[PDB]
Design a protein around this ligand. Structure first.
Ligand SMILES: OC[C@H]1O[C@@H](S[C@@H]2O[C@H](CO)[C@@H](O)[C@H](O)[C@H]2O)[C@H](O)[C@@H](n2cc(-c3ccc(F)cc3)nn2)[C@H]1O
Ligand SMILES: [Cl-]
Length: 138
């Protein structure tokens, strides 16, 4: 329903209590997905499901500053399944992004980029059919 890669503007950046919801379906035989919360060219929060990294499924999270990736954070809980519909919810909290998939808490990612009100775009990329991408305040 939406064209991938998709850019969702986040007007005025993010703020605690802001909830971002992504609905879509993973393609058959998917290889990768990425969500990129961006501050200009920097990536404040990269959330990257990998379906086949050495025959393991893993989510890699990181930050990109001045074109350099930092220290990866890895989660081996892997809630996505090729061919199936999913919901990703990203709740901005004071100290971290809090991510739930299909209504189950998955991970938290501490804020490395601290100018939250400059994290003004979300890019959505990879091997999905994207149904919708939106935000609200809770
Ligand atoms: O850190 C995180 C980054 O990781 C690297 S790979 C990394 O490379 C290190 C040096 O060789 C190595 O040391 C680490 O082991 C290994 O993980 C990815 O290319 C990076 N990426 C992934 C994507 C991407 C684009 C579109 C999509 F739909 C899905 C994903 N765009 N950029 C990024 O995910
Ligand atoms: Cl990747």
């Amino acid at each position: 329903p939406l064209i991938v890669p998709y850019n969702l503007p986040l007007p005025g950046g993010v703020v605690p209590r802001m909830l971002i919801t992504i609905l879509g379906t993973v393609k058959p035989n998917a290889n990768r997905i990425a969500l990129d919360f961006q501050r200009g060219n920097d990536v404040a929060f990269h959330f990257n499901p990998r379906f086949n990294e050495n025959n393991r499924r893993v989510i890699v999270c990181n930050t990109k500053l001045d074109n350099n990736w930092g220290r990866e954070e890895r989660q081996s809980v892997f809630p996505f399944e090729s061919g199936k519909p999913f919901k990703i919810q990203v709740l901005v909290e004071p100290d971290h992004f809090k991510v739930a998939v299909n209504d189950a808490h998955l991970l938290q990612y501490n804020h490395r980029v601290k100018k939250l009100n400059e994290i003004s775009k979300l890019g959505i990329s990879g091997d999905i059919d994207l149904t919708s991408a939106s935000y609200t305040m809770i």
